[PDB]
Amino acid sequence: DATDITIYYKTGWTHPHIHYSLNQGAWTTLPGVPLTKSEYEGYVKVTIEAEEGSQLRAAFNNGSGQWDNNQGRDYDFSSGVHTLADGRILSGTP
Numbered sequence: 301d302a303t304d305i306t307i308y309y310k311t312g313w314t315h316p317h318i319h320y321s322l323n324q325g326a327w328t329t330l331p332g333v334p335l336t337k338s339e340y341e342g343y344v345k346v347t348i349e350a351e352e353g354s355q356l357r358a359a360f361n362n363g364s365g366q367w368d369n370n371q372g373r374d375y376d377f378s379s380g381v382h383t384l385a386d387g388r389i390l391s392g393t394p
Contacts, residue, residue: 302380305348305356308394309335310385315363316344322356331363340394343383354379 309316319332335344348356355378359369368387369375375384383394 308383313362320358
């Protein structure tokens with residue numbers, strides 16, 4: 301049973317950030333946490349420390365007010381690993 305929340309995100313932004321609320325808690329202070337490039341070209345990655353049975357709600361930004369917020373639904377990610385690319389989420393790595 302997975303614990304941390306690891307997210308891969310396809311983006312060409314140079315300063316991508318994840319803004320999120322973990323387990324229905326407080327949201328990060330803007331602009332949120334930076335994502336660091338993965339060796340999967342075009343993808344950035346973050347791992348959010350979390351307990352068993354965790355879920356976060358997230359929106360991504362370019363550090364300067366351009367957003368990807370899933371048409372206002374925001375993106376939901378559970379304990380485990382997930383890859384978001386052009387609005388589609390698949391479990392696991394790229």
